[PDB]
Design a protein around this ligand. Sequence first.
Ligand code: NA
Lengths: 306, 306
Amino acid sequence: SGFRKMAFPSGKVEGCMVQVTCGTTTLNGLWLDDVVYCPRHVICTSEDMLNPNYEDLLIRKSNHNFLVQAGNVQLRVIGHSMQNCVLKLKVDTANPKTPKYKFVRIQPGQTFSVLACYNGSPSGVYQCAMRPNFTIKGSFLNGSAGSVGFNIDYDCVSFCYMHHMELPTGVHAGTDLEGNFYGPFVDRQTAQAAGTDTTITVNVLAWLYAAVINGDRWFLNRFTTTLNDFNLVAMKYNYEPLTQDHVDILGPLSAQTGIAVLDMCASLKELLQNGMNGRTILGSALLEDEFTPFDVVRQCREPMLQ
Amino acid sequence: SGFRKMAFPSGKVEGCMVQVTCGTTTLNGLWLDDVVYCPRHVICTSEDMLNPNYEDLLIRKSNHNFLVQAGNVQLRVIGHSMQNCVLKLKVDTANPKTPKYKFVRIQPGQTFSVLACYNGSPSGVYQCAMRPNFTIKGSFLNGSAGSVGFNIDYDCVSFCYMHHMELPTGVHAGTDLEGNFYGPFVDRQTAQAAGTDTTITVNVLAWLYAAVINGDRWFLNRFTTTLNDFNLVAMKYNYEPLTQDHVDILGPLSAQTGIAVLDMCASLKELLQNGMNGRTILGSALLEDEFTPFDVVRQCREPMLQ
Ligand code: NA
């Protein structure tokens, strides 16, 4: 038993991380087969990062202006192109450690593992949720751009995030691997207007189920409510709407614990209306919303099947 | 910026995990050079996990009785021995992915990364701290024994923990890689209370420095305290004593922020006596104690040196 924020094992992704240097600017790249993907602002000086004309900046670069290092080994860039906010650097050797992979665009409320990297070298791994306002609350310093976020599903690494920037509020923003930002952000030094964030209701419910499975039951009440009435409550506390699809997704956790989803919703309603009584749930003194139903079943599942 | 619980990249350890099966008992082993290290209870049936004379049960076992699998590849066992609570299986093939490594014994309050594994296959990675009662608050299911804890320094993996068991209280206990348990625990189905879990004071102070560096400042005050006057308060709340060695370890964080260690002690003293009053620190409504000063330095340092 136990419940901990857990990342996927990072080795398959570590074997893909490289350093990309243009001039005096260094960040990370993702080396898959014969292409290195990286944030386009590697072609900027620090001053260029204020109001870059990326098309013009890229035209002045040639292949040999891109210094790509895979460990101690320099990879030769033989082509370059820009796709949205990422560069694709074709190199003359393919990465023999390329995992089976795909590029996906994740949805707000979903989680992924971040492999934080500096100078092409993996430094740390942690789990992030894509916030409803399309930021992530991560830990990133200068030089971390090009670090990626991913999930691992059977025989496949699904890359969903490439890190680009830190908003002046201290939260983080980036793109999918097609180079399109999550949220209304741009890779330049201008006002970045993140939406007011909200709490991921389906995830809070999943985490309450995790707590029950681990013996933390004090917050259960015998009340139940309707989906519409719960959502009227959720709205008041800046919680996202709970849909029938969410209720369905919580089905396995509901079945395992014997607690109907709308029963647990009534327990969550009482926690929102009356507080947590100075008590903790799974070691937290706040309601936690960065665990998906799948994250919870990964650690807490007890199959009826024997 | 930002501050997140972060694990070390797990790839170097992933390449060392194997499955060890004896009869119908399976768990994980750590394959370094031509030795596989695993918990000795793999030689026991689930029922035999009570009053097991491991020396007796081991003598009944031969090399062929140990099925060691590195993925789908079987490793021929050519010798077997017991060191305290670990089995060492000599295999006929050195692990070609063996990293530079050390076995170390960690102290309470220190952190490490756990690569949770089942059937020799890594499932997740998270950061944990050795509690003052020598337990770990982890996330471990049956079949996770033999999962290891570690830290990485440059290229060297320091293995400090091998998982064995879950106490009936739901916390976790294990050994170093020489098989010596951390704490007064035995790998037997017998009563074994852990000591009182206390709060790692020096780590709480480190985390408050992290908070200040990330702009959380509301808990700073004009109170002063001596070290002993602080310990007289914190001992009443089951906080570990703060020694002058801890004060010295916090020096670099004190210097970066300009907040004397004892002035941050005066802040912590107030938080203990009176709570947060509905406020949070780094997204938590409780005082976090599983980040070491080094953990804080890794993510928040702002070196004077340029
Ligand atoms: Na209820």
